[PDB]
């Protein structure tokens, strides 16, 4: 259970496969998620699979399948600032310590 997310490379076909398995026509990226059961099944399958869930703050924002598609291909990367600074390719005269 770690908030790091790295989007898959077969995400188009997986997501499309889930859209067919919840249903199916062409132009499937413009399917409205107005039906609430359809949205719950689609995002519940994706959360079960990818381990990455659409938050409550964004859950109303996807009204098409394309928006879920655009959500599941942002890399949410989670580590401490000590691990972000020390990995940002420091010059040889910066030294950072964490008295924590």
């Amino acid at each position: 259970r770690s908030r790091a997310y790295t989007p898959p490379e077969d995400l188009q076909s997986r997501l499309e496969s889930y859209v067919k398995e919840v249903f199916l026509p062409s132009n499937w990226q413009d399917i409205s998620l107005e039906d609430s059961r359809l949205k719950f099944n689609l995002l519940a399958h994706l959360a079960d699979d990818l381990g990455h869930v659409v938050p409550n703050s964004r859950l109303h924002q996807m009204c098409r399948v394309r928006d879920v598609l655009d959500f599941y291909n942002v890399p949410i990367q989670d580590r401490s600032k000590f691990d972000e600074l020390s990995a940002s390719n420091l010059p040889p005269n910066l030294k950072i310590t964490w008295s924590y």
Binding site: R1, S36, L43, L59
Partner: protein, 250 residues
């Protein structure tokens, strides 16, 4: 099957309702049991942090009564007669040994008596303050909605482990609809914890939504809050208090 709490009150035509996951506390790793949508005029109003500051300072200060009192130059003991005559001595002219310049005298402008700091904001501003707290908790991703607060066991350590696993926060405000019908398990679990607090839905305020990092509603409390807060919009000016009987109120 899911749990899909559609919105009961009439939404405006130009706003679609805002959705949220429904979770449960039964499963230690069982979130996302259903998907409730929520009324946009109570869970997606304008941010409005100024009103949070109004309602937070109202809640702090209206109940406040300061008991600080000091004694004035009349109330302090003795000091009725001139200490020395007006003119003849080389000392300063004094009238009592209890004037505020003396060591032991009264206080010139000290605190006087119990003072009350009572004031009411209008009830539409308190109600709007509750709405704003709800949209802010939902937008910051701190609202979580349960179907019921029924735990598989009554230990505190279960609930802290659950709150640690789902990355809630240091302090959780659990809200159930009534005080009578709160499940025995959540009562036994949260009656021992310092930071996880049970409150009935009547007890919901703004100081304790800001004090706690996460806030946890149940679906009956969500319908309750939509009902009680969307009522303040679209209601007449009162003829007399709403405790008195009306055509349609309770």
């Amino acid at each position: 099957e899911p749990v899909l709490r559609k919105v009961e009150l009439p939404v405006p035509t130009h706003r679609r309702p805002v959705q949220a996951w429904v979770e449960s506390l039964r499963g230690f790793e069982q979130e996302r049991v259903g998907l409730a949508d929520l009324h946009p005029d109570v869970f997606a109003t304008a941010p409005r942090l100024d009103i949070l500051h109004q309602v937070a300072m109202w809640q702090k200060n209206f109940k406040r009564i300061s008991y600080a009192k000091t004694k004035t130059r009349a109330e302090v003991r003795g000091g009725g007669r001139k200490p020395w005559p007006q003119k003849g001595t080389g000392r300063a002219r004094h009238g009592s040994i209890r004037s505020p310049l003396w060591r032991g005298g009264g206080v010139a402008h000290g605190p006087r008596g119990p003072t009350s700091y009572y004031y009411m904001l209008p009830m539409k501003v308190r109600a709007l303050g509750l709405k704003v707290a709800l949209t802010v908790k939902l937008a910051q991703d701190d609202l979580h909605i349960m179907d019921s607060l029924e735990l598989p066991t009554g230990d505190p350590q279960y609930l802290t482990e659950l709150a640690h696993y789902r990355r809630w926060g240091d302090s959780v405000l659990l809200v159930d609809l009534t005080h009578e019908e709160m499940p025995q398990s959540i009562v036994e679990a949260t009656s021992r914890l310092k930071t996880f607090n049970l409150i009935p839905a009547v007890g919901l305020n703004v100081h304790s939504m800001l004090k706690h990092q996460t806030l946890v509603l149940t679906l009956p409390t969500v319908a309750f809050l939509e009902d009680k807060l969307l009522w303040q919009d679209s209601r007449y000016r009162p003829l007399y208090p709403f405790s008195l009987p009306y055509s349609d109120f309770p």
